[PDB]
Amino acid sequence: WSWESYLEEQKAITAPVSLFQDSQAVTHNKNGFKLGMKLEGIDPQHPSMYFILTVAEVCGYRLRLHFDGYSECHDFWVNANSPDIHPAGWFEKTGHKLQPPKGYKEEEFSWSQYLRSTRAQAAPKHLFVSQSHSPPPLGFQVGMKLEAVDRMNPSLVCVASVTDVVDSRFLVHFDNWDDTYDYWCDPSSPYIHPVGWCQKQGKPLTPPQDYPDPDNFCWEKYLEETGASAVPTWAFKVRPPHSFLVNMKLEAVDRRNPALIRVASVEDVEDHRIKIHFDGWSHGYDFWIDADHPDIHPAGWCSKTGHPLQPPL
Ligand SMILES: O=C(c1cncc(Br)c1)N1CCC(N2CCCC2)CC1
């Protein structure tokens, strides 16, 4: 099975490499993560939280991570160039809380101690694209407030705060709702807006959970009472729409089984999202995804990085 003859017979084209970010497309980077290495990372299900993680498996430019002390059924996959993982010691250097391994208390964890107990090796620093050393996203400070789309309920735009800053990105948290709604982004995110936006657009604005009298929510007053500034207007950047077109072919990570990367088609487009369809599978497995998502790649990525590719069914 090859991309070449498959394209021939389908009279199809692949999405050009140029339609992707460099980090989605890059194949010549070696993967230096080795089995048993320990590091720190965000929980995908709790994007504001950081845990002790061990490399459980390495495949191509990808690695499977395991939550030390917890069940293997929580394991997840990231790419070797993910910004959501950090070297041992990072949490305490950059102001982040670390949840310790199951059984430990947060006033009982020490890397040096834990490395002795487990006889384990920390993932070397140089492997991580993200260590909080590069320029911060201009204008966005921890504490500042803005309006953001609830990506879980995307029809809503809500009162939100910047609660974390890590290298070129920041974390958007929805005032007084659970952290499970938080998501990471950057100045160009299509889902974020200055304080005031909902009002200039005619749109209704979703106030923090439990805010007395939602319809008469007042930004100016809420800011004063919470001792907070609004992200300044100039900080927000227009991201241009992606250039993907319906029926372009590519490679995408399987959601229901994330170990696998399948042949894929662009089923439907939006300005910033694409709908993925896995060739020869039922359309019921189709799903939408942002165009900058680390888990879509150009044709040949699997080949060039040495990760198996699932041919169409
Ligand atoms: O489940 C919902 C919901 C309920 N009914 C209609 C919609 Br549309 C959404 N909500 C309201 C929105 C809440 N978001 C707002 C900001 C983050 C949480 C989550 C719970």
From Swiss-Prot:
GO term, biological process aspect, one: heterochromatin formation
GO MF terms held by the record: chromatin binding; histone binding; histone H4K20me2 reader activity; identical protein binding; methylated histone binding; nucleosome binding; SAM domain binding; zinc ion binding
Keyword Transcription regulation carried by entry: yes
PTM section of the record: Ubiquitinated in a VCP/p97-dependent way following DNA damage, leading to its removal from DNA damage sites, promoting accessibility of H4K20me2 mark for DNA repair protein TP53BP1, which is then recruited to DNA damage sites.
Keyword Hydrolase part of the UniProt annotation: no
Any one Gene Ontology cellular component term annotated for this protein: chromatin lock complex
Domain notes: The MBT repeat 2 specifically recognizes and binds monomethylated and dimethylated proteins. In contrast, it does not bind trimethylated proteins. The MBT repeat 1 does not bind methylated peptides but inserts a proline ring in a Pro-Ser-Ser/Thr sequence context.
Protein name as annotated: Lethal(3)malignant brain tumor-like protein 1
Organism of provenance: Homo sapiens
Boundaries of the shown chain within the full protein: 274 to 586 of 840
